[PDB]
Design a protein around this ligand. Structure first.
Ligand SMILES: N=C(N)NC(=O)Cn1c(-c2ccccc2)ccc1-c1ccc(NC(=O)c2cccc(Br)c2)cc1
Length: 360
């Protein structure tokens, strides 16, 4: 069964091997992109990298990739090689690999990963949708079911977790698995039908929550909310946590806030419930997150403003077991075996609630 439990370890990475003989690398698990991209030239921040010349099973595709973004970029050439996940399914797959030769502001100092595993769909793959993403190759080439699960655990008092490919490990979650449909197969896009802060509805038009789009992204730390929703959220959090106040550099995710050891007044901060569209249009279900999740360890406010829609990143995925059921075009949520909570409140997955349009 699961040689896959605790296979995850500044982001969550899994161990993979590339080439022949196998070249061990640490690879970020990223549900918000679709390239399998690995460092393949020396970098100050890289202590190891993919060396194509050492791979007997490397094939050049004679094609480059260029990926600029607001801050830096990555460039490399495209090839294919044999790819395994030692603590995953016992298979080897020929997958596309973007060998990164030049980059800036891509690799992180001390992160411990040398590449990225894009688990989203072909539509958003570089340079275009013809470059089959890794998981697409995996399913087609092997008998692994078109599904994977993510249990991100965080710190608690270095991060750990499990990535279960081709199935659902029932020992990883508690209670009920609730599914929200994948709206479109590009990012893992979903629809948020309502949000409340401490049971208090933001009462905004449904479309504001998905203003542009809403995605589930393991490669983002924060819960990122569209401008209008962010401002409403922080106003509601500031009010609930009014008894003794913080600098506004804290609310913008710049400044940290410290108490000592265990005095931390968690119950001063409110819970956040995200209601996601159910499989029955009319039906919905909530995902409730504690301050233990949106205040990440001294703590930083891990909710930030977005200009590209809602991003449900790591801080909301932690404490939930998240199933990426590509086969049935849906994403399941269940309370995780590892969720961090106090003796008064718990992360929750509850439903149904009956509630639209909402899609932007
Ligand atoms: N939006 C995503 N989910 N993923 C990306 O944008 C992937 N990506 C790309 C990229 C852009 C387009 C296509 C293919 C790749 C460039 C730089 C990153 C890139 C690389 C690493 C990280 N994340 C982290 O380093 C990280 C740091 C702390 C916590 C966590 Br969780 C992640 C984010 C983006």
């Amino acid at each position: 069964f699961v040689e896959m439990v605790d296979n995850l370890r500044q982001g969550y990475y899994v161990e993979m091997t590339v080439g022949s003989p196998p070249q061990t690398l640490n690879i970020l698990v990223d549900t918000g992109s679709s390239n399998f991209a690995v460092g393949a030239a020396p970098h100050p921040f890289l202590h190891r990298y993919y060396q194509r010349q050492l791979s007997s099973t490397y094939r050049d595709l004679r094609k480059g990739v260029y990926v600029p973004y607001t801050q830096g970029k990555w460039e490399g050439e495209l090839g294919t090689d044999l790819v395994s996940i030692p603590h995953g399914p016992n298979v080897t797959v020929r997958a596309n690999i973007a060998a990164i030769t030049e980059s800036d502001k891509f690799f992180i100092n001390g992160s411990n990963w040398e590449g990225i595993l894009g688990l989203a769909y072909a539509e958003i793959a570089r340079p275009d949708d013809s470059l089959e993403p890794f998981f697409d190759s995996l399913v087609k080439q092997t008998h692994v079911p078109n599904l994977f699960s993510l249990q991100l655990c965080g710190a608690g008092f270095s991060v750990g977790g499990s990535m279960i490919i081709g199935g659902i490990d029932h020992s990883l979650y508690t209670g009920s698995l609730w599914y929200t449909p994948i709206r479109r197969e590009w990012y893992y896009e979903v629809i948020i039908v309502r949000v409340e802060i401490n049971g208090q509805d933001l009462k905004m038009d449904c479309k504001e929550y998905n203003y542009d789009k809403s995605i589930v992204d393991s490669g983002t730390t924060n819960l990122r909310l569209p401008k209008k929703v962010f401002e409403a959220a922080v106003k509601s959090i500031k009010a609930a946590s009014s008894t003794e106040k913080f600098p506004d550099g804290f609310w913008l995710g710049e400044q940290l806030v410290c108490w000592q050891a265990g005095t931390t007044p968690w119950n001063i901060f409110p819970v956040i419930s995200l209601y996601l569209m159910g499989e029955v249009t009319n039906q919905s279900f909530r995902i409730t997150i504690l301050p233990q999740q949106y205040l990440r360890p001294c703590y930083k406010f891990a909710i930030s403003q977005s200009s590209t829609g809602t991003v449900m990143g790591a801080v909301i995925m932690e404490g939930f077991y998240v199933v990426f059921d590509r086969a049935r075009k849906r994403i399941g949520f269940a309370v995780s075996a590892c969720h961090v909570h106090d003796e008064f409140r718990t992360a929750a997955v509850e439903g149904p609630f009956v509630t639209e349009d909402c899609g932007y």
